[PDB]
């Protein structure tokens, strides 16, 4: 076996398991899901003795997994290498937990002002906290100044990037926070109007938006004198955002 050497022996047979997903979503202003999918991978930090035989199972709540691209050791069952390695990549598109709901509200004031209001609605267990929340609201190219106040977090107008950045430390599920802006516009040519860019989001949530959960991870070493009841197994679900936009 060319991915694992013989004779490995650890004292504390531990097992770290990270489930890493990236939720992608495009949503109309009215809340209709235009396109959405999750891209995920499962990495395993293995510290087991000898040449163990491992069986990884899950709910395949339920979830269907569209694509699969496995490591070279599998057949699920596998002899895992020593250390950190990627066990599998996957992608689902059905029954995806959308962790946040961006609700834009833009109101023209003649041809000079732009009163804008954006509401975030967290949509998960209130016992869990989302972290590293960023909401990017793009401003028109003909902006002289913006005026924003917000309840939770802090907001700044990065005029160079031509957008408003709103950052929130944490936010529990089943909650809502809002931000309100006044945008002063220079006069310009009404001709082109402007291509309304979407409102982007970035967050971290301690669960798999695909609903995936680890049913079992069995370890089997027949030669050595340890069984699966002796393995200190851990699992860590982390979901990041990728392309998370709402048409405004």
């Amino acid at each position: 076996i060319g991915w694992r050497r013989e004779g490995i022996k650890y004292r504390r047979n531990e097992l770290f398991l990270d489930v890493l997903e990236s939720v992608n979503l495009l949503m109309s202003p009215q809340g209709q899901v235009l396109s959405a999918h999750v891209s995920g991978r499962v990495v395993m930090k293995s510290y087991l003795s000898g040449m163990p035989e491992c069986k990884f199972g899950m709910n395949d709540q339920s979830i269907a997994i569209d694509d699969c691209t496995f490591h070279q050791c599998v057949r699920i069952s596998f002899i895992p290498p020593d250390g950190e390695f990627e066990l599998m990549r996957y992608r689902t598109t059905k029954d995806i937990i959308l962790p946040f709901r961006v609700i834009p509200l833009v109101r023209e004031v003649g041809r000079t002002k732009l009163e804008v209001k954006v509401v975030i609605k967290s949509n998960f267990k209130p016992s869990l906290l989302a972290q590293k929340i960023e909401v990017r609201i793009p401003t028109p190219l003909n902006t002289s100044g913006v005026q924003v106040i917000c309840m939770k977090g802090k907001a700044k107008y990065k005029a160079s990037e031509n957008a408003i950045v709103w950052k929130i430390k944490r936010m529990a599920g089943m909650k809502e926070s809002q931000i309100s802006a006044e945008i002063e516009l220079l006069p310009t040519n009404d001709k082109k109007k402007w291509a309304r860019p979407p409102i982007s989001m970035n967050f971290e949530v301690p669960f798999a938006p695909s609903g995936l959960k680890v049913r079992y991870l069995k370890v089997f070493e027949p030669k050595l004198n340890y069984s699966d009841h002796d393995v200190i197994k851990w699992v860590r679900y982390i979901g990041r955002s990728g392309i998370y936009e709402t048409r405004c």
């Binding site: 097992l15 398991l17 680890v214 991870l217 197994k233 851990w234 699992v235 860590r236």
Partner: peptide, 6 residues
């Protein structure tokens, strides 16, 4: 950080 597998 991590949680134990039940």
């Amino acid at each position: 950080c991590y949680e134990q597998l039940n």
